[PDB]
PDB file of C-alpha atoms and ligand atoms in Angstrom:
ATOM      1  CA  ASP A   1     158.785  59.771  11.069  1.00 49.09           C
ATOM      2  CA  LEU A   2     156.426  56.881  10.928  1.00 47.42           C
ATOM      3  CA  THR A   3     158.952  54.763  12.786  1.00 45.71           C
ATOM      4  CA  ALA A   4     159.056  57.057  15.877  1.00 46.69           C
ATOM      5  CA  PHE A   5     155.182  57.202  15.810  1.00 49.15           C
ATOM      6  CA  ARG A   6     155.050  53.386  15.705  1.00 51.06           C
ATOM      7  CA  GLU A   7     157.358  53.314  18.819  1.00 49.95           C
ATOM      8  CA  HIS A   8     154.724  55.311  20.621  1.00 50.93           C
ATOM      9  CA  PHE A   9     151.884  53.365  19.238  1.00 50.15           C
ATOM     10  CA  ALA A  10     153.489  49.890  20.426  1.00 50.12           C
ATOM     11  CA  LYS A  11     153.413  51.430  24.025  1.00 50.02           C
ATOM     12  CA  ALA A  12     150.165  53.214  24.199  1.00 50.21           C
ATOM     13  CA  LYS A  13     147.485  51.779  26.542  1.00 47.26           C
ATOM     14  CA  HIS A  14     144.759  54.282  25.727  1.00 48.43           C
ATOM     15  CA  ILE A  15     144.519  55.893  22.422  1.00 47.81           C
ATOM     16  CA  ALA A  16     141.862  58.653  21.558  1.00 46.98           C
ATOM     17  CA  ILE A  17     141.266  59.191  17.971  1.00 51.00           C
ATOM     18  CA  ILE A  18     139.323  62.481  16.970  1.00 53.28           C
ATOM     19  CA  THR A  19     137.968  62.422  13.462  1.00 53.75           C
ATOM     20  CA  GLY A  20     136.624  65.246  11.242  1.00 53.92           C
ATOM     21  CA  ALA A  21     134.969  65.707   7.870  1.00 54.24           C
ATOM     22  CA  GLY A  22     138.056  64.623   5.854  1.00 55.18           C
ATOM     23  CA  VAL A  23     137.434  60.898   6.850  1.00 57.19           C
ATOM     24  CA  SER A  24     133.890  61.221   5.495  1.00 59.36           C
ATOM     25  CA  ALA A  25     134.713  63.145   2.308  1.00 61.00           C
ATOM     26  CA  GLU A  26     136.963  60.124   1.331  1.00 58.74           C
ATOM     27  CA  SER A  27     133.796  57.827   1.506  1.00 62.19           C
ATOM     28  CA  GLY A  28     132.195  59.917  -1.251  1.00 62.50           C
ATOM     29  CA  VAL A  29     129.980  61.688   1.446  1.00 62.49           C
ATOM     30  CA  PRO A  30     129.172  65.445   0.748  1.00 62.74           C
ATOM     31  CA  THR A  31     129.783  67.754   3.643  1.00 64.53           C
ATOM     32  CA  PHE A  32     128.060  70.689   2.123  1.00 68.85           C
ATOM     33  CA  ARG A  33     130.653  73.246   3.398  1.00 69.72           C
ATOM     34  CA  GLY A  34     133.114  74.356   0.671  1.00 71.20           C
ATOM     35  CA  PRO A  35     132.528  75.482  -2.999  1.00 68.96           C
ATOM     36  CA  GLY A  36     130.925  72.261  -4.123  1.00 66.19           C
ATOM     37  CA  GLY A  37     128.749  71.972  -1.051  1.00 63.38           C
ATOM     38  CA  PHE A  38     125.423  73.097  -2.499  1.00 62.67           C
ATOM     39  CA  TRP A  39     122.103  71.245  -2.095  1.00 62.86           C
ATOM     40  CA  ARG A  40     119.634  73.116  -4.262  1.00 63.50           C
ATOM     41  CA  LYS A  41     120.351  76.909  -3.521  1.00 65.24           C
ATOM     42  CA  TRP A  42     121.657  76.230  -0.061  1.00 64.47           C
ATOM     43  CA  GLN A  43     124.703  75.320   1.817  1.00 61.52           C
ATOM     44  CA  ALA A  44     124.794  73.405   5.102  1.00 57.92           C
ATOM     45  CA  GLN A  45     125.166  76.600   7.099  1.00 63.28           C
ATOM     46  CA  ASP A  46     121.699  77.825   5.938  1.00 63.06           C
ATOM     47  CA  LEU A  47     119.883  74.846   6.787  1.00 65.23           C
ATOM     48  CA  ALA A  48     121.438  73.122   9.978  1.00 69.20           C
ATOM     49  CA  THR A  49     119.862  75.729  12.295  1.00 69.18           C
ATOM     50  CA  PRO A  50     116.618  75.648  14.405  1.00 65.15           C
ATOM     51  CA  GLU A  51     115.479  78.981  12.636  1.00 64.93           C
ATOM     52  CA  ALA A  52     115.387  77.001   9.400  1.00 65.92           C
ATOM     53  CA  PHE A  53     113.604  74.222  11.067  1.00 63.73           C
ATOM     54  CA  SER A  54     111.238  76.390  12.860  1.00 63.76           C
ATOM     55  CA  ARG A  55     110.126  78.338   9.585  1.00 61.50           C
ATOM     56  CA  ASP A  56     110.436  75.510   6.872  1.00 58.85           C
ATOM     57  CA  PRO A  57     110.535  71.978   8.697  1.00 59.31           C
ATOM     58  CA  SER A  58     109.607  70.331   5.334  1.00 58.04           C
ATOM     59  CA  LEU A  59     112.749  71.826   3.596  1.00 58.37           C
ATOM     60  CA  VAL A  60     115.125  70.943   6.374  1.00 56.41           C
ATOM     61  CA  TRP A  61     113.740  67.397   6.428  1.00 58.02           C
ATOM     62  CA  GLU A  62     113.978  67.085   2.464  1.00 60.71           C
ATOM     63  CA  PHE A  63     117.657  67.960   3.071  1.00 59.79           C
ATOM     64  CA  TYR A  64     118.471  65.498   5.910  1.00 60.74           C
ATOM     65  CA  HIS A  65     116.245  62.787   4.009  1.00 58.74           C
ATOM     66  CA  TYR A  66     118.535  63.255   0.925  1.00 59.24           C
ATOM     67  CA  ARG A  67     121.425  62.899   3.237  1.00 55.67           C
ATOM     68  CA  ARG A  68     120.173  59.796   4.812  1.00 53.84           C
ATOM     69  CA  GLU A  69     119.565  58.257   1.312  1.00 53.93           C
ATOM     70  CA  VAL A  70     122.786  59.058  -0.141  1.00 53.19           C
ATOM     71  CA  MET A  71     124.355  57.085   2.871  1.00 53.83           C
ATOM     72  CA  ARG A  72     122.830  53.904   1.484  1.00 55.01           C
ATOM     73  CA  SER A  73     125.605  53.858  -1.378  1.00 56.73           C
ATOM     74  CA  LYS A  74     128.445  55.383   0.487  1.00 55.19           C
ATOM     75  CA  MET A  75     130.655  52.804   2.456  1.00 60.53           C
ATOM     76  CA  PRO A  76     133.384  52.848   5.059  1.00 66.16           C
ATOM     77  CA  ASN A  77     136.913  53.485   3.773  1.00 66.89           C
ATOM     78  CA  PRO A  78     140.036  52.082   4.694  1.00 67.60           C
ATOM     79  CA  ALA A  79     140.797  54.602   7.554  1.00 66.20           C
ATOM     80  CA  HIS A  80     137.371  53.803   9.114  1.00 66.59           C
ATOM     81  CA  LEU A  81     138.279  50.081   8.878  1.00 66.71           C
ATOM     82  CA  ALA A  82     141.766  50.427  10.200  1.00 65.10           C
ATOM     83  CA  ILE A  83     140.330  52.169  13.192  1.00 67.71           C
ATOM     84  CA  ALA A  84     137.809  49.517  13.735  1.00 67.90           C
ATOM     85  CA  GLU A  85     140.054  46.737  13.552  1.00 71.55           C
ATOM     86  CA  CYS A  86     142.742  48.602  15.622  1.00 74.04           C
ATOM     87  CA  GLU A  87     140.160  49.021  18.492  1.00 73.42           C
ATOM     88  CA  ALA A  88     139.150  45.270  18.264  1.00 75.09           C
ATOM     89  CA  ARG A  89     142.645  43.957  18.225  1.00 73.32           C
ATOM     90  CA  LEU A  90     143.933  46.219  21.150  1.00 72.34           C
ATOM     91  CA  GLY A  91     140.876  45.726  23.124  1.00 71.66           C
ATOM     92  CA  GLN A  92     141.879  42.043  23.122  1.00 68.37           C
ATOM     93  CA  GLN A  93     145.158  42.996  24.674  1.00 67.39           C
ATOM     94  CA  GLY A  94     143.480  45.207  27.382  1.00 66.30           C
ATOM     95  CA  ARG A  95     144.357  48.433  25.428  1.00 66.88           C
ATOM     96  CA  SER A  96     141.839  50.953  25.008  1.00 67.62           C
ATOM     97  CA  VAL A  97     140.818  52.925  21.691  1.00 66.86           C
ATOM     98  CA  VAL A  98     138.019  55.601  21.854  1.00 66.12           C
ATOM     99  CA  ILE A  99     136.863  57.534  18.837  1.00 70.01           C
ATOM    100  CA  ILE A 100     135.505  61.084  19.118  1.00 69.16           C
ATOM    101  CA  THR A 101     133.875  62.019  15.936  1.00 68.51           C
ATOM    102  CA  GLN A 102     132.603  65.293  14.667  1.00 68.77           C
ATOM    103  CA  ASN A 103     130.749  63.151  11.692  1.00 71.46           C
ATOM    104  CA  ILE A 104     127.078  62.293  11.746  1.00 72.34           C
ATOM    105  CA  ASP A 105     127.158  59.597   9.132  1.00 68.46           C
ATOM    106  CA  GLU A 106     127.512  56.607  11.341  1.00 64.89           C
ATOM    107  CA  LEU A 107     130.286  55.180   9.118  1.00 64.71           C
ATOM    108  CA  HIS A 108     132.452  54.479  12.209  1.00 61.43           C
ATOM    109  CA  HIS A 109     129.715  52.302  13.423  1.00 62.16           C
ATOM    110  CA  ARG A 110     129.319  50.476  10.080  1.00 61.90           C
ATOM    111  CA  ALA A 111     132.953  49.870  10.155  1.00 59.98           C
ATOM    112  CA  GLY A 112     132.747  48.045  13.357  1.00 58.02           C
ATOM    113  CA  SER A 113     133.931  50.653  15.915  1.00 57.77           C
ATOM    114  CA  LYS A 114     132.140  50.272  19.317  1.00 56.62           C
ATOM    115  CA  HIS A 115     133.551  53.100  21.626  1.00 58.29           C
ATOM    116  CA  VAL A 116     132.543  55.908  19.570  1.00 60.01           C
ATOM    117  CA  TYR A 117     131.266  59.366  21.028  1.00 64.13           C
ATOM    118  CA  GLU A 118     129.320  61.133  18.281  1.00 60.14           C
ATOM    119  CA  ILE A 119     129.713  64.872  19.410  1.00 63.05           C
ATOM    120  CA  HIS A 120     127.360  66.265  16.891  1.00 64.95           C
ATOM    121  CA  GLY A 121     124.835  63.594  16.852  1.00 65.30           C
ATOM    122  CA  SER A 122     123.748  61.323  13.855  1.00 62.26           C
ATOM    123  CA  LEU A 123     121.842  61.481  10.744  1.00 64.69           C
ATOM    124  CA  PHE A 124     120.187  58.261  11.667  1.00 66.06           C
ATOM    125  CA  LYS A 125     118.803  59.286  15.089  1.00 65.51           C
ATOM    126  CA  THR A 126     115.749  61.415  15.814  1.00 67.71           C
ATOM    127  CA  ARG A 127     114.902  63.591  18.839  1.00 68.75           C
ATOM    128  CA  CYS A 128     111.165  64.395  19.528  1.00 69.46           C
ATOM    129  CA  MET A 129     110.513  68.021  19.751  1.00 69.11           C
ATOM    130  CA  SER A 130     107.798  67.438  22.228  1.00 67.75           C
ATOM    131  CA  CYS A 131     108.826  64.577  24.657  1.00 64.56           C
ATOM    132  CA  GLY A 132     112.556  64.678  23.887  1.00 66.58           C
ATOM    133  CA  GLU A 133     113.009  60.984  23.183  1.00 66.20           C
ATOM    134  CA  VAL A 134     115.954  59.901  21.177  1.00 66.18           C
ATOM    135  CA  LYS A 135     115.645  56.972  18.782  1.00 67.21           C
ATOM    136  CA  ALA A 136     117.786  55.354  16.295  1.00 68.77           C
ATOM    137  CA  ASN A 137     116.142  55.409  12.749  1.00 69.18           C
ATOM    138  CA  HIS A 138     117.436  53.939   9.528  1.00 69.29           C
ATOM    139  CA  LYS A 139     114.138  53.764   7.651  1.00 67.06           C
ATOM    140  CA  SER A 140     114.232  54.259   4.019  1.00 70.92           C
ATOM    141  CA  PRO A 141     112.223  56.588   3.552  1.00 73.20           C
ATOM    142  CA  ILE A 142     111.789  57.819   7.208  1.00 75.20           C
ATOM    143  CA  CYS A 143     108.155  58.596   6.571  1.00 75.27           C
ATOM    144  CA  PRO A 144     105.928  57.909   3.439  1.00 71.90           C
ATOM    145  CA  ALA A 145     105.484  61.678   2.729  1.00 70.32           C
ATOM    146  CA  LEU A 146     109.325  62.031   2.251  1.00 70.26           C
ATOM    147  CA  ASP A 147     109.521  58.973  -0.242  1.00 70.33           C
ATOM    148  CA  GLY A 148     111.233  60.228  -3.507  1.00 66.59           C
ATOM    149  CA  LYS A 149     111.710  63.675  -2.122  1.00 68.67           C
ATOM    150  CA  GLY A 150     115.052  65.606  -1.389  1.00 68.53           C
ATOM    151  CA  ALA A 151     116.408  66.018  -4.853  1.00 69.77           C
ATOM    152  CA  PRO A 152     119.428  68.266  -5.022  1.00 68.90           C
ATOM    153  CA  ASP A 153     119.006  70.256  -8.184  1.00 65.69           C
ATOM    154  CA  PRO A 154     118.367  73.904  -7.707  1.00 66.46           C
ATOM    155  CA  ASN A 155     115.047  73.930  -9.620  1.00 65.74           C
ATOM    156  CA  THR A 156     113.595  70.923  -7.984  1.00 65.58           C
ATOM    157  CA  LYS A 157     110.328  71.887  -6.626  1.00 65.68           C
ATOM    158  CA  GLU A 158     109.633  71.991  -2.873  1.00 64.62           C
ATOM    159  CA  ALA A 159     107.826  69.015  -1.390  1.00 64.83           C
ATOM    160  CA  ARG A 160     106.046  71.348   1.134  1.00 67.47           C
ATOM    161  CA  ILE A 161     104.848  68.581   3.133  1.00 69.25           C
ATOM    162  CA  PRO A 162     102.178  69.417   5.901  1.00 66.45           C
ATOM    163  CA  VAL A 163     103.985  69.396   9.316  1.00 66.55           C
ATOM    164  CA  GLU A 164     101.685  66.563  10.511  1.00 67.54           C
ATOM    165  CA  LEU A 165     102.926  64.158   7.785  1.00 64.58           C
ATOM    166  CA  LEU A 166     106.730  64.860   8.536  1.00 66.31           C
ATOM    167  CA  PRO A 167     108.404  62.210  10.846  1.00 62.64           C
ATOM    168  CA  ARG A 168     106.395  61.839  14.134  1.00 61.72           C
ATOM    169  CA  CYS A 169     106.966  60.566  17.417  1.00 61.18           C
ATOM    170  CA  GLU A 170     105.635  56.949  17.827  1.00 58.45           C
ATOM    171  CA  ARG A 171     104.425  57.059  21.284  1.00 60.27           C
ATOM    172  CA  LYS A 172     100.382  57.202  20.410  1.00 56.92           C
ATOM    173  CA  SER A 173     100.055  59.901  22.981  1.00 59.47           C
ATOM    174  CA  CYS A 174     102.745  62.225  22.293  1.00 60.29           C
ATOM    175  CA  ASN A 175     102.986  62.238  18.463  1.00 58.57           C
ATOM    176  CA  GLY A 176     105.425  65.112  18.375  1.00 58.11           C
ATOM    177  CA  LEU A 177     107.393  66.443  15.528  1.00 57.31           C
ATOM    178  CA  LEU A 178     110.609  64.579  15.150  1.00 54.22           C
ATOM    179  CA  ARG A 179     113.887  66.494  14.332  1.00 54.23           C
ATOM    180  CA  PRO A 180     117.312  64.912  13.305  1.00 50.12           C
ATOM    181  CA  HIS A 181     119.178  64.397  16.505  1.00 53.79           C
ATOM    182  CA  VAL A 182     122.058  66.470  15.349  1.00 51.99           C
ATOM    183  CA  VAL A 183     123.740  69.522  16.907  1.00 52.15           C
ATOM    184  CA  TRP A 184     122.885  72.526  14.676  1.00 49.29           C
ATOM    185  CA  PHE A 185     124.571  75.773  14.225  1.00 47.67           C
ATOM    186  CA  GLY A 186     123.536  77.904  17.288  1.00 44.74           C
ATOM    187  CA  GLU A 187     123.180  75.018  19.593  1.00 46.85           C
ATOM    188  CA  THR A 188     125.377  73.631  22.440  1.00 47.11           C
ATOM    189  CA  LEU A 189     127.307  70.319  22.542  1.00 45.11           C
ATOM    190  CA  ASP A 190     125.732  67.991  24.998  1.00 44.57           C
ATOM    191  CA  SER A 191     127.378  68.414  28.462  1.00 44.56           C
ATOM    192  CA  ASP A 192     127.318  64.722  29.403  1.00 43.68           C
ATOM    193  CA  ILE A 193     129.036  63.805  26.230  1.00 44.54           C
ATOM    194  CA  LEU A 194     131.661  66.442  26.754  1.00 43.50           C
ATOM    195  CA  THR A 195     132.237  65.228  30.335  1.00 42.35           C
ATOM    196  CA  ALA A 196     132.833  61.735  28.927  1.00 43.72           C
ATOM    197  CA  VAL A 197     135.230  62.889  26.339  1.00 42.49           C
ATOM    198  CA  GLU A 198     137.000  64.959  28.958  1.00 41.56           C
ATOM    199  CA  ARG A 199     137.597  61.864  31.031  1.00 46.21           C
ATOM    200  CA  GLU A 200     138.879  59.857  27.997  1.00 45.41           C
ATOM    201  CA  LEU A 201     141.083  62.491  26.851  1.00 43.82           C
ATOM    202  CA  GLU A 202     142.604  63.027  30.196  1.00 44.66           C
ATOM    203  CA  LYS A 203     143.330  59.160  30.573  1.00 44.67           C
ATOM    204  CA  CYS A 204     144.683  58.647  27.079  1.00 44.17           C
ATOM    205  CA  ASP A 205     148.447  58.344  26.357  1.00 45.54           C
ATOM    206  CA  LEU A 206     148.455  58.916  22.696  1.00 49.29           C
ATOM    207  CA  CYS A 207     145.933  60.958  20.485  1.00 52.53           C
ATOM    208  CA  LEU A 208     145.369  60.889  16.621  1.00 55.76           C
ATOM    209  CA  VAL A 209     143.619  63.562  14.877  1.00 56.27           C
ATOM    210  CA  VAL A 210     142.185  62.310  11.635  1.00 57.40           C
ATOM    211  CA  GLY A 211     140.486  64.203   8.629  1.00 58.47           C
ATOM    212  CA  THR A 212     140.802  67.479  10.393  1.00 56.13           C
ATOM    213  CA  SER A 213     143.285  69.690  12.217  1.00 58.34           C
ATOM    214  CA  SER A 214     144.317  69.903  15.946  1.00 60.47           C
ATOM    215  CA  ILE A 215     144.498  73.733  15.570  1.00 61.77           C
ATOM    216  CA  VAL A 216     140.949  73.993  14.302  1.00 61.39           C
ATOM    217  CA  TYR A 217     137.675  72.903  16.131  1.00 62.54           C
ATOM    218  CA  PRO A 218     136.590  70.627  17.642  1.00 61.14           C
ATOM    219  CA  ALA A 219     140.155  69.410  18.054  1.00 65.05           C
ATOM    220  CA  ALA A 220     141.249  72.785  19.500  1.00 68.35           C
ATOM    221  CA  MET A 221     139.045  72.157  22.663  1.00 71.41           C
ATOM    222  CA  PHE A 222     140.694  69.155  23.519  1.00 71.68           C
ATOM    223  CA  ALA A 223     143.853  68.219  21.720  1.00 68.89           C
ATOM    224  CA  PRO A 224     145.502  71.146  23.786  1.00 70.84           C
ATOM    225  CA  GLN A 225     144.507  69.645  27.023  1.00 70.53           C
ATOM    226  CA  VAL A 226     146.229  66.236  25.978  1.00 75.57           C
ATOM    227  CA  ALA A 227     149.419  67.987  24.448  1.00 73.38           C
ATOM    228  CA  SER A 228     149.751  69.919  27.908  1.00 74.75           C
ATOM    229  CA  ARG A 229     150.142  66.552  29.630  1.00 73.78           C
ATOM    230  CA  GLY A 230     152.981  65.974  27.370  1.00 70.87           C
ATOM    231  CA  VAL A 231     150.956  63.378  25.288  1.00 75.44           C
ATOM    232  CA  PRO A 232     152.052  62.817  21.704  1.00 72.77           C
ATOM    233  CA  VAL A 233     149.577  63.988  19.069  1.00 71.96           C
ATOM    234  CA  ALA A 234     149.549  62.575  15.441  1.00 67.20           C
ATOM    235  CA  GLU A 235     147.639  64.338  12.571  1.00 68.26           C
ATOM    236  CA  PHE A 236     146.477  62.460   9.543  1.00 66.17           C
ATOM    237  CA  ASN A 237     145.083  64.924   7.070  1.00 65.70           C
ATOM    238  CA  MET A 238     145.570  66.084   3.555  1.00 64.82           C
ATOM    239  CA  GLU A 239     146.484  69.800   4.991  1.00 62.93           C
ATOM    240  CA  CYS A 240     149.963  71.027   4.341  1.00 60.65           C
ATOM    241  CA  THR A 241     152.244  72.535   7.082  1.00 58.44           C
ATOM    242  CA  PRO A 242     154.977  74.903   6.144  1.00 59.98           C
ATOM    243  CA  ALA A 243     158.685  73.861   5.551  1.00 61.93           C
ATOM    244  CA  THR A 244     160.026  74.948   9.071  1.00 61.36           C
ATOM    245  CA  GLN A 245     158.265  72.198  10.815  1.00 63.02           C
ATOM    246  CA  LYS A 246     154.062  66.049  17.682  1.00 60.81           C
ATOM    247  CA  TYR A 247     153.655  64.354  14.290  1.00 64.39           C
ATOM    248  CA  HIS A 248     151.957  64.883  10.861  1.00 63.77           C
ATOM    249  CA  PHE A 249     151.284  62.470   8.071  1.00 64.62           C
ATOM    250  CA  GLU A 250     150.196  64.469   4.948  1.00 66.37           C
ATOM    251  CA  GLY A 251     147.620  62.741   2.526  1.00 67.07           C
ATOM    252  CA  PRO A 252     144.400  60.642   2.385  1.00 68.20           C
ATOM    253  CA  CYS A 253     143.862  58.921   5.595  1.00 71.55           C
ATOM    254  CA  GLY A 254     142.783  55.884   3.880  1.00 70.57           C
ATOM    255  CA  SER A 255     146.324  55.700   2.727  1.00 73.42           C
ATOM    256  CA  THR A 256     148.313  56.763   5.604  1.00 74.17           C
ATOM    257  CA  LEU A 257     146.386  55.243   8.597  1.00 70.02           C
ATOM    258  CA  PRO A 258     146.302  51.484   7.727  1.00 68.90           C
ATOM    259  CA  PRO A 259     150.039  51.434   7.421  1.00 67.19           C
ATOM    260  CA  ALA A 260     150.428  53.594  10.667  1.00 69.30           C
ATOM    261  CA  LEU A 261     147.956  51.511  12.727  1.00 69.77           C
ATOM    262  CA  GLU A 262     149.163  47.779  11.429  1.00 66.13           C
TER     263      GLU A 262
ATOM    264  CA  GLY B   1     127.481  75.092  26.789  1.00 64.88           C
ATOM    265  CA  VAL B   2     129.854  74.841  24.018  1.00 64.02           C
ATOM    266  CA  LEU B   3     128.462  76.612  20.978  1.00 63.30           C
ATOM    267  CA  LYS B   4     128.756  74.363  17.826  1.00 64.98           C
ATOM    268  CA  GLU B   5     132.068  75.617  16.205  1.00 63.36           C
ATOM    269  CA  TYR B   6     132.403  78.399  18.934  1.00 60.71           C
ATOM    270  CA  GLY B   7     129.506  80.131  17.025  1.00 60.72           C
ATOM    271  CA  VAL B   8     131.756  81.314  14.247  1.00 59.29           C
TER     272      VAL B   8
HETATM  273 ZN1  LIG C   1     107.570  62.200  21.659  1.00 60.00          ZN
END
């Protein structure tokens, strides 16, 4: 019941919005997990790992360069926008909205959202493998050697870029190999980020889970914590629940969410 | 530290 949800929405002083891959798929943004989610011969799971990067950094950078480049044509959707404008409007009223996103596409930022926790990192940040410095980076192409590389066809030839010509750290003293500042399979989420997220979740009085499920990860880490405080949770996702069924709005979030958050 | 996707 949308009206019952909106009664909670009217009263909420601190909303936490958790977003998963569904919100990015609706912007035309490939996830690379699922039957369609091939890039050349590989799926995301094969490439987004430190072992792939150690043994073929050029291949992994071709993949991330492709993804960075494809974001130029993909735009925020009505769900991203509703979330951004909601935060702005409620902020003026002294009410807090925070976004906790699994997504690395920066679309929430492009939509206008300010209070955003990117728990998996970002496609458009680098981390230096040598000195550890994290830097925002939106250059197209990120380095000259990658220019025009990353084609997704299976029989596209590998660039095989010497490591010295991949993106490097710009402190002319370090010069270390950069990696995407993204959490890979086999890596831990940042402790400091999780502590901040725990604070926000503990203080919130309404939580929305958008383009993923409360029962799946990462929502499963944190939504239980909020539910056990007695706080209402509202899912917006395309997933069904059975017939013998907190709140669930089935469908594309770019349809459901702007109406819900009016 | 939390393994991405519980290591699944
Ligand atoms: Zn460095």
